[PDB]
Each structure stands twice: as C-alpha cells, then as structure tokens.
Amino acid sequence: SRVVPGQFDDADSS
Amino acid sequence: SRVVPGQFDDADSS
Amino acid sequence: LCMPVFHPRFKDWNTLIVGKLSPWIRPDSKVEKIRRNSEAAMLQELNFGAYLGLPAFLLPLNQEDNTNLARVLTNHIHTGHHSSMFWMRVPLVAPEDLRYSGEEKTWMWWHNFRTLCDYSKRIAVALEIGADLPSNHVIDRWLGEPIKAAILPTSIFLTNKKGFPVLSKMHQRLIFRLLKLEVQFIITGTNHHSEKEFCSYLQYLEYLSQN
Amino acid sequence: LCMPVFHPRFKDWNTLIVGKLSPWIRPDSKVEKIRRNSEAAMLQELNFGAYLGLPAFLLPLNQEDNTNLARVLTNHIHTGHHSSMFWMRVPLVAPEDLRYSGEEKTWMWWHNFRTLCDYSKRIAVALEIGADLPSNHVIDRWLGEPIKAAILPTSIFLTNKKGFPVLSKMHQRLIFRLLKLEVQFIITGTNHHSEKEFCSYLQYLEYLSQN
C-alpha cells in the first residue's frame, strides 16, 4: 500500500 | 425466515 | 451470500455490504418450473437480506423481458420489510453482441423495467463495464439514469511498464465521468488475486480521481 | 480477507465488516524468521484495513506472551492511519485446557496485553465461547473488561425437538448477560450451512433477547 514511482503510468502497449 | 411453532423451544436432550 | 462495495471517501476508501441474488435464479426462464422455483427463492433471499439490514441488493437483468422479476420485486416492496434499495446489474454492452435495438439495447432493458416499477425511487442501476464501449450518444443516455455503482472486472485493466493495473485511455474517460456522480465501486474477478494485488486497483482509481 | 459482524438492531439485524488477520501470522513465534515475516505481514494487513475504512480489526491472542503483537500494534496506531478499533479474539476457556493460572488464565492474557497498550481506548475484546464454561467469579471478571463482540461457533448450539439450533441452558444465561452490553455477534462454522439454515441462528438470538 506504499505507492511507487510510475505506479499509475499509462500502458505503453495494449 | 418465517417463524414456526416451537422454533425456539429448548433441547429436550443434549 | 454477499458482496463488498467500495465507496470513495474523497469528495481513504469505505466498504459496505450488498446482497447478491443466487445466480441460478431465473424468474423469467422460458421453462415453467424454473420460473416457479426462482420466484420462490428470490423472495427467500430478499427477506433474508432485509432481515440483515443490508443497505442494497443486487438484482441482475440481462435480457429484454423481466416482467416476472419486476412483479416479485414490487410485491416484496409492498410488504414493508425491504433493504430499501435495489441495484439492477446491467451491462453497458450486451455480451452476446460481442460474439432502438442497437447499442441502446441494454438501456431499453433498464428503461422498460424502470417503468414497470413505476419509476420507483428504490430502484437504481449498477452498471457493468466491459472491454467494448458504446458511442457517446448512448453514454449520455445512461448518465441520465440513476447509477449507484459501477462494476469493473479486473480483466479490463491493462498493465503498464511498471507492472500494475491501469485503465485504457477510453476507459479512463468513462470512469472519470462516473466518479463525478460519486458512485460506489465493485470489482469482480478478485479470484487468484492476492490481497496486496487487489489493493492496487483501488489505488489506481483513487489516483484517477485527480486527472 | 474479511468477516461479517451482526449487530442487533433492537434496544431486525444490522451487518458490518471487520478485517481479520491472516492465520499464519504469528508475531511471537519461538522461531526468529517467523517473527520477522509475521511482523511485516501484520502491518501490510493493518494498513490495507485502514485504507478500506474497516471500522474494526480482529487480532487473535491465544498465548501468554504477546509483546511482539503489542509493539507492532502500538507502532501502527502512532502513524495515524488506523481502523481506529482493534478487537482482540480471546477464548473464554483455553482450548489446550480441555485436552492466577486456573480458569482466569485467558483473562490474564488479555489483561497483560491491555496494560502493554496502556489501556488504549482503541483496544477492546471479542470473546470466543466454547462448550465448557468457567465459574461466575471469572465471568464477573470478564464483564468488567470492554467486550465489543462475542464469537459463537455453530457447534455450541443444540438442536431441539423441532430440529432447530438452540443454546444450552447454561449458555443461554451467559448470552443474555452479553446482550445486556449490546455486543455485536460473530458466528463461525457457517461452512456447509445453507443460507436459510444460517438465518435461524440469528432468529434464535433475537428471540433470546426477550427471556
């Protein structure tokens, strides 16, 4: 439950 | 969930 | 047997319980016998839910005709011992479509049932999201209806470079439109999902709140 | 993974959610490695519970020594992101006893932990009932403590002539003493129990309210 850098970044692929 | 007669009577045995 | 709803505590989550009708129950089965068995079992379960004080109850509609489902439900409300909110589980897109009768189909489903219950304030909708998304004219229509919750399967999340669940860009625009109504959330497919993994889906949705 | 508590709406039930620590977690294991793994996992789960807004969390104590369990818990409270109530799951009678060090043993367990947490108002007890019952001098002692809930296994109910679950006469006198404090209820052993069968246990307890 500790947020990390880039956690919420978009999928650069599908 | 419709209560019937004697539902809550005591166990006449163990 | 019940189901956990998650309501965002940001206007920090909150969790509540809603009941779920057993799946084998099909009050509008073409078959006679199933209709009678299901009409009976539905009332058993609605009263068990009222007895526990469940704030809402989830009833699925996934076909055109729901006259039987509307009647049993109207009857159960008349008694006075009711959970006092009923969330109809409806797909934004019909699953049979993906292998006005078009993309507005499932809306008509709801609208027809809605009118059968005389626009009862006790009846709302719990909308189920899939991979396919319909137009905006139909998305607009739905947003006029009373959506209490949105049902999101784990299968519609992409994983990103860092290896975490995220929503497609189209899906992000939809959800954001749903957090504007303050709906509650339900996540399906938590099977084979650690409790630390399931926690991230909620983290993402909380982040998505500010975008 | 969570657990449903049932609170009597009579002063008509109500249902709420409390979290449960995974069972493999043993912060005071004699073994070093388990202590470290468990101390870590406990915090993972306490914060996941706070994140969901769970009103209480169930932490088991079933041995004399709980220094490790008290410390991790005191640490987690200090952070400020806490479910804000912790119910310690304690047996009225020690299970190893049934195949002051006597019947007051499990009370000392709690009392010792209670003092380790500096009589924290966030810490209460969830008392577990078995078949054996201790004296009244020890029942008196417990009723001074802050019991929030009582844990009742299906296995302690007798069936009566009509074929329904009922409490032994001794057990009835105890429970009645517990509905006087307005505790909440937890029923274990619902496995292999239809939802219509599980409903009767609650019916009985509601009847027992007037006796």
Numbering used by the authors:
A (entry chain B), B (entry chain B): 1 to 14
C (entry chain A), D (entry chain A): 41 to 51, 77 to 164, 179 to 290
What did the article's authors report about this structure?
Symmetric methylation of both arginine nitrogens is mainly catalysed by PRMT5, which methylates histones H2A, H3 and H4 and various non‐histone targets. Target selection depends on adaptor proteins which bind to PRMT5 and recruit specific substrates to the PRMT5 active site. PRMT5 contains three domains, that is, the catalytic site‐containing Rossmann fold, a β‐barrel domain used for dimerization, and the TIM barrel, which acts as interaction site for MEP50.[ 3a , 3c ] PRMT5 and MEP50 form a hetero‐octameric complex whose structure has been determined, [3a] and structural information on the interaction between PRMT5 and the other adaptor proteins has only very recently been described in preliminary form. We report the characterisation of the interface between the TIM barrel of PRMT5 and the adaptor proteins pICln, RioK1 and COPR5, and identify the consensus amino acid sequence GQF[D/E]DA[E/D] involved in binding.
A co‐crystal structure of a RioK1 derived peptide with the PRMT5 TIM barrel domain confirmed the results of our mutation and truncation studies. The protein structure shows an unusual seven‐stranded β‐sheet with one antiparallel strand for the TIM barrel which is not observed in other PRMT5–MEP50 complexes.[ 3a , 3c ] The conformation was confirmed by anomalous density maps using both the sulphur anomalous signal of Cys and Met as well as a platinum anomalous signal after soaking of the crystals in potassium tetrachloroplatinate solution. The reasons for the difference in the core structure are presumably the missing MEP50 interaction partner as well as a shortening of the PRMT5 construct. The region spanning residues 1–40 and 52–76 normally interacting and wrapping around the MEP50 insertion finger as well as region 165–178, constituting a loop interfacing with MEP50, were unstructured in this case. A significant part of the groove is positively charged and seems to interact electrostatically with the negatively charged end of the peptide, whereas the remaining area of the binding site is hydrophobic. Asp18 is in position to form a salt bride with Lys248. The peptide orientation in the groove and its conformation is further stabilised by a peculiar S‐shaped double β‐turn, spanning from Val12 to Asp17, fixing the hot‐spot residues in the correct position.
